[PDB]
Amino acid sequence: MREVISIHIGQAGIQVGNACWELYCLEHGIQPDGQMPDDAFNTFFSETGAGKHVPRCIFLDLEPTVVDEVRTGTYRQLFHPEQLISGKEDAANNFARGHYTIGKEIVDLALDRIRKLADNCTGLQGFLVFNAVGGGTGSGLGSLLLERLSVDYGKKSKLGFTVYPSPQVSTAVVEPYNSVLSTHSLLEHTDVAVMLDNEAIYDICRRSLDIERPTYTNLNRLIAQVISSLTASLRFDGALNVDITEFQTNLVPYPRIHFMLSSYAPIISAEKAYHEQLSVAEITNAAFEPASMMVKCDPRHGKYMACCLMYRGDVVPKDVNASVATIKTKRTIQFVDWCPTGFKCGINYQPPTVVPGGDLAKVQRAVCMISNSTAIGEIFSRLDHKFDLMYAKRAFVHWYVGEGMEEGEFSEAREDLAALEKDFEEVGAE
Amino acid sequence: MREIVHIQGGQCGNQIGAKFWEVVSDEHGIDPTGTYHGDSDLQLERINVYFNEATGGRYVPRAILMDLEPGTMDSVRSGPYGQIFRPDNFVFGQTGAGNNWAKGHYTEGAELIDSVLDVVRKEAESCDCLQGFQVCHSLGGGTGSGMGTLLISKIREEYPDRMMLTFSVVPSPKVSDTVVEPYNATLSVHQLVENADECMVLDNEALYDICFRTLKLTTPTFGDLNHLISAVMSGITCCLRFPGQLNADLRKLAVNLIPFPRLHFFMVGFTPLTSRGSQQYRALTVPELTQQMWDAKNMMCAADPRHGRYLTASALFRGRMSTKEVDEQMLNVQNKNSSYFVEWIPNNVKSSVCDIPPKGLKMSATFIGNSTAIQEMFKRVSEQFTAMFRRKAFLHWYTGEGMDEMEFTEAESNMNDLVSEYQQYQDASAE
Amino acid sequence: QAVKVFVRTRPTATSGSGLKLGPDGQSVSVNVPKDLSAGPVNNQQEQFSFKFDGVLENVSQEAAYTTLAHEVVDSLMAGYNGTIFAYGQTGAGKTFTMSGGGTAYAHRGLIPRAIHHVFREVDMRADKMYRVHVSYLEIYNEQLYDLLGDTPGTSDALAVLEDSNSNTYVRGLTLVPVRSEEEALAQFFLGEQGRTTAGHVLNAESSRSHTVFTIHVEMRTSDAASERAVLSKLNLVDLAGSERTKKTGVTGQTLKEAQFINRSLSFLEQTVNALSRKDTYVPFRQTKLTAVLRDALGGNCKTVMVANIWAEPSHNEETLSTLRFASRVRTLTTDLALNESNDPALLLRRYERQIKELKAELAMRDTLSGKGRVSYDDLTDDELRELHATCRRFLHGEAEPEDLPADSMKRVRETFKALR
Amino acid sequence: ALLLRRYERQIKELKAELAMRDTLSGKGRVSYDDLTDDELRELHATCRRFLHGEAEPEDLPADSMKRVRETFKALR
């Protein structure tokens, strides 16, 4: 009825999909076998005549190991065996490899599977594309898939929850290259892009959950919680229902600028839980704290343009209004001159469930703040330097060219992110 | 025998209408299964205003619910009084309007409007004599405002002479819910000025202030705000449903209230709104009801009347009361606050009395004030609309729906003309 | 710039008991007969006198045009705006004055005579080049129905937009260019066919819609080339009669639309009242009539109201209502601005001409100052002055020095003594 | 747009330069921007049968095209 089709591309995509689908199974009570002992599962699961529920997801990767971990894991009877798609050779952190050479047949098969999933949709709110900007599988194949989806499906709302390279810390070397390339690719196709930084999520885990040794499972669990809070209004009723199609109209002022910071609150363990009141105003303040951002991008540098708040649990509109009034009256937070409202408040009556074995505690209230701000230009400033620093003398460029690109594509991407830079400066300046 | 066709639009409008129908059925003694259980002749005397009789004793509301997403009316049908409404009067699209007035008025509302008008015509032709339509919805919402204005235009075309009453939830001043509230409100006010004969302006923040200051509630949810709005929507037409010492129907209120056609936006309030703690501590007298009536805090619109000038003001009292008491009290109010009252109207008061107060209340009174204070609400909405429109923020969403950019400027011009209209009659001098 | 409220009386072919009089062509007085039965020597209301800018007891349409709108059309061709609209009783000759029966339909009525004079003026002023457009829209039941071109009959996209460049115009109105008198007549008669008229007791074919025929004039100079162009208007409006709504009775689109006509007329009169009081805003949006006539009745437009009255023994009340409205209209006086086009290319070309002539003259004077300017030269060659006189029929220049060649030889000896 | 603004600024600078030159010249005549009082042209045409004259630096559009060719040769 209000179905959303999920795509998980690359290792990071599939590994956040594991957390996402564990969270959805726990929320709906669906056992890992596929069946549970109204119709709130319809957003994420389609039920068969036998009573088994199959999720409307597609695990796309060119590397077999990540998909095979799911194929052999507890969720082997849950997903459709063909919905798990594996390639033969990894894209090897090569945007060109994942976009031009290996990605072709795989994206053809993925489009066929996505088409037949959508043929099972009465309504279709949109797509949830989860990948990692900075790798060939994520960047290249994800970009190609988004291009094809924009060409064929058309106006369906695609939300790309991309993971961008951190400012300083990183795991790959050619990460700036494929990051700039994929940014150029998805600047014109995804409708709402959500930035995520491993560094910021690590800092959140270290300061708030007191996890001195964070890992990818924890990062993906927080990301899944953010996505679940985002989609909560699709499944559970509440005051101030906010919709997937409503996100763009209330958050994207100009089509070019649709990159969004995400922040969750509260982020606490059980030991620290039930030690603070966790009032609505306090959790809103925490959500608008710069350290709670899941992107290494200080909002104090720029100006907020829109802020969509998604509350879950025992939240009353009087409390949310008082909290947002205090936020507006606070001097540290600055909005643009041309967006006096700048706020999209939404509440839902279903508190987020706690995944057993995680570190998040059972809290009656939750806030997912997704903000469109001009401060995000800072991350593009970092990547546009890390790119050209390698590019002037053309390091690693032979690799990308060997999979069907030119310096023309690199220069086009670089100037396109420069256009995005002066775009951000424009929307910031009076 | 003077029927009223109720229409609910959007999420806010549908919730308000559901609460309104719950309150009306409660006041008429109708249980959620439709059977009358009031044990009073007067309740069934004029039940035909709001309800029709089915084959059995069931009484179904003359209401029509619209939405572009089925979730809101699924919640309505799951509500306590969800089964009274016609299953055929639930009209829904498939994809909701993303808070987009353009989507709710041009692209997505166009297909559903034919079904809406079909159902509306079916309900209206069944009526013996039709007083008119009442449409409950919210300004600043996609499906709500868009379909509300489109339907109001269509009904104005079909039934020009029939009364049109609108209960519009204007976006709140201080804290805004959606970002595109100024756009939707400015576009909707343009349609309401031209089409709606009578319009009620309500603000959620004013409702929060009234429920936190007079009702002194701790956790006022949207149910309570819808309950207050529903109480006012009942009180406006109780003169149609119950015997009155000096009765006054909707057209009489419109005639006595609207001096000039464009100045049909009214701030309204209900009395007696008493906190639970001081319910026993308050004395129910007509002077007390009037004193609470003319307070600015009692107003359910954000604008406070002290800034502006009362063009007109009607009060529909309910209960066994002295007309001498009522008339003397409101004449005294006018004399004492003559500065806030227009000079070129000798009496700014339309007093009406009904003999049946709402259940539990010995006396009550609904107030409908047409004052130039609403100038500041329109002015604030324009202060936001111009700020957004100079940079064309979010304008591509409306433009891609097939609405010209010129329409925004034309709507702003109309709204500013209304503002200056209010200002002219605020500072106009006699002779 | 004043409002010239003229009055025209319908010649009663039945020759009813006429009570109106005109002593000097300016004032008109009506004596209502006092009711003998009702309160003998206790009534005290018999006489009502008014003063206007002219009265026409019984004149032909030619005389009516000459005394009514000749100056307004002349102003239209001089660049000013103009607005002639009729008001009065139903069947009082409003449509008759405003392009009615006239005599023989051979350039009779007001609008046909107006367009005939328009094109006569365009022909005669062969110096300047004109661009004439026409439009013909009817306000019926507070809806704008365009008549020229196709007739959708649904009021589609027809909305009166505010002054883009200080004049109110109609968006979606089919503006029809005209280049000869015959197609102007054809468009107007198409409008005449298309407009809504209904049977009535006072008038056999009563006009139940306020019809507005706007002649848009776009000037351009003799040299033209994007200089002083466009932005002139002339609205000829025939309002619908003000019916007492006690004879019609029938709701079958005779009373329901009569109520709309009365409301539009009352809104117009209220606008007139606010303008006479000279209050700040004087609302114009309360009806399509005031919206259309927003620039008129104010703005920058020369308005001349026509008051068609019908002197009958029982029509005295309606006649007095019309006269009171006309008297209150006479208080008004509007502006007259020579508004011209705001075309971007027009501005650019017109002042690139300016910049080139300025730099040419600057260079000439700089060279004269630096190199040296020799005055009192060629004083013996009168053949130069003769050649200048000959070339005056063409486009040529003259010597700048020596008081501009002695004012071009005293303007070529006053153009050879005005061509002898 | 940009061309209009630049050309208008150039015209203003040219006018300022002309005024500065007239400051050192004998006297400051009219800027010859335009002729709003077109009735002056008719007055000059009427005075063309008498003793008068007004040309100044801009020649006043060549005496208004020689009084419009002497009123079109006195209406031919």
Ligand SMILES: Nc1nc2c(ncn2[C@@H]2O[C@H](COP(=O)(O)OP(=O)(O)OP(=O)(O)O)[C@@H](O)[C@H]2O)c(=O)[nH]1
């Ligand atoms: N937040 C988050 N990011 C991850 C996680 N796993 C991997 N990443 C990021 O994903 C990027 C690479 O992902 P992929 O491109 O899919 O790696 P792959 O599957 O081997 O495919 P290629 O590298 O393109 O050949 C790395 O730069 C990591 O920063 C994760 O579990 N959580």
Ligand SMILES: Nc1nc2c(ncn2[C@@H]2O[C@H](COP(=O)(O)OP(=O)(O)O)[C@@H](O)[C@H]2O)c(=O)[nH]1
């Ligand atoms: N009084 C009241 N107002 C509401 C309720 N729900 C939403 N609103 C207000 O309605 C405004 C517009 O929302 P709405 O028009 O319903 O969204 P739409 O239905 O998608 O067009 C928002 O600013 C809310 O503050 C409710 O239950 N009661």
Ligand SMILES: Nc1ncnc2c1ncn2[C@@H]1O[C@H](COP(=O)(O)OP(=O)(O)O)[C@@H](O)[C@H]1O
């Ligand atoms: N010289 C005249 N002046 C005024 N009315 C005349 C004259 N000659 C004839 N009439 C009559 O006036 C009528 C036109 O009235 P009209 O203006 O159409 O009424 P309305 O004002 O309702 O439109 C014609 O039927 C005609 O018989």
